[PDB]
């Protein structure tokens, strides 16, 4: 998600 500092897709 957008608010996640480092999202894993």
């Amino acid at each position, epitope marked *: *998600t*957008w608010l*996640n*500092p*480092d*999202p*894993s*897709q």
Partner: antibody
Amino acid sequence: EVQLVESGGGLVQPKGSLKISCAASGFTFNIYAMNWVRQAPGKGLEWVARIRSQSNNYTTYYADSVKDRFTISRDDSQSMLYLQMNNLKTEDTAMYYCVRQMGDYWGQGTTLTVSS
Amino acid sequence: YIQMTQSPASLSVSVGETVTITCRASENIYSFLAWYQQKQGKSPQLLVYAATNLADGVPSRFSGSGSGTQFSLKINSLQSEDFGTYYCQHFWGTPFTFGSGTKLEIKR
């Protein structure tokens, strides 16, 4: 608040090298993924590189027109983001932006001029 | 790679008027799209994230909608300060690519 301050941009001879910097404060730097975005004078925005947090082994991503030539790095101890730029070409002349995560915060940018 | 095509390239809008900027994605990008407003000599400011979420300190007149492949930003009763260049960007994979931009002028 959150701030990203760019520095290092100047005039570089073509085929030359330059390291630009981004200083971060007002947030936990070491958990956020970071990236560089550029904007040639008068043109649109082009995404250039991304670097993930330490927890995700620092995996890096680049744009094809920049690969094997620009290297994105970060010093988490000093909340610093860097961009090593080697073998600079004319088309690399741009405003370089320090962007946080996916795009929520942008730095004011440093100008890079590649001219002889 | 995903190609974002934006429309229109430029608008001449009068104060109080409402107008919509559209932006289409080559592939399906679900809802992984953001909107930016940029003012000349300045860095782009985030308007809407995940297609429909208004970012902090942004007027309620900015409405983002769309999911899948077709997206559009809407400005209700455009103010004098709403001048600038509006960009879309997807965030579904590397590289994050941008729309070609929409230059927005104030009618006078």
